[PDB]
Amino acid sequence: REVISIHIGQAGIQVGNACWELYCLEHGIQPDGQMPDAFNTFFSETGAGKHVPRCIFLDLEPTVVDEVRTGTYRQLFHPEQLISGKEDAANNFARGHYTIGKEIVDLALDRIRKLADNCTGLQGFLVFNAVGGGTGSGLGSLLLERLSVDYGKKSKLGFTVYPSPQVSTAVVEPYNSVLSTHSLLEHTDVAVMLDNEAIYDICRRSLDIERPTYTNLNRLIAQVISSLTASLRFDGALNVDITEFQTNLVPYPRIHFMLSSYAPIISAEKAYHEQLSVAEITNAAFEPASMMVKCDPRHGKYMACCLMYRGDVVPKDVNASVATIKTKRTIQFVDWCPTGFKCGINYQPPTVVPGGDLAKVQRAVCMISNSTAIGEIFSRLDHKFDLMYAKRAFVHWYVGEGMEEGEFSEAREDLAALEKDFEEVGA
């Protein structure tokens, strides 16, 4: 039951740095690489006394890859799994998609084929990238395209990091995000957005860290991924595999964009102050203040919802909470889906990392829901892509590295068509 993860870009491999530390701590594997068979879905055991992860970090800037190579987990990672180039795409989708992508994707696919060949019960691939950059956008999209054409129907779970509405780090990220989502439409099976200002708000408000960095953000992302694969890793009252999200959250082949949320996210003092029960954690998982995406479903309609429960959870009270949520009309569902819920339960509570900020709890919930506030997000992004595209700014770059105006026009009109798609579906 092995699932393999591929990290594309500087954000992707830092998220990988957090996730793999979490996995080693969960399965009791020392950073040197050996314990002092649940591990089998993430690590493969080589010979005697050594476990190597099933992942590849692929990137173009070598600085962070050599940081990984000379960090603490020097021996945990196989040397060939760490793919590094020599020069960046420099926030250029064209440069990372046509010039250097066509040189690096071949080796990336060559290593992924070996990982899949070693795999036995492959659940699917899952990708970690931020669409705002150049590498993870361009060659991330290229790698997804070729992986889809090579494997066809395997589940490709994309944990994408979209740019925040107001907080930004670049200027060409509208271009990059539009040109990446255009190709993400036809190839990604399940896609989950992750904004940065939402996680910043979560850390500032609930985890009361007044000066957070990317490390805390990656830690929360790793917590989410661990909660989402806990069903495969450990046995529970009602276990779930990765394949079920495709069938239970994607009513139409183009509508795969889901809002991730997690609860509780509490400090070591708020943990002492308040008790955590299934009813209140389910209620809090529906708040806009605990979402991983900066959007409000108050204006949207819940097309579907998936609830993952970890720890001291029984089915009766989760049924009761879901029933009360449905009976109350505070949130409303699309009338073409009265059966809009999917529950799953696992026994193991989430683990705590030394030096972390979360306190250990009895129970936790991860929501992956699908609504139309994502349709609001896409139009909001199209606004600021349109503004800069009106005067053809920064487009001379993309044309020089090898794109043309046809691709820009087709991507923008594809996003407009997706807007009309969402408008009609939400009716």
Partner: protein, 68 residues
């Protein structure tokens, strides 16, 4: 090359069971023309003797067609 049906072992010779996990080679199994059409089927009986469509040292004769 072609992969003939085994009639007892093809269940274990399924591509997914062999940890292939990509789209398998269907040409080798379709160029055989079984009775059923799938990999669980019986071959067609043959009769007579096969002529030499090739000349010596592996050169095709002029009459027989070939891909360019």
């Amino acid at each position: 090359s072609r992969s003939y049906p085994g009639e007892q072992v093809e269940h274990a010779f399924n591509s997914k069971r062999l940890k292939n996990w990509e789209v398998p080679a269907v040409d080798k199994s379709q160029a055989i023309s079984t009775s059923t059409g799938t990999r669980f089927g019986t071959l067609q009986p043959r009769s007579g003797r096969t002529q030499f469509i090739v000349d010596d040292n592996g050169h095709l004769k002029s009459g027989v067609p070939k891909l360019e």
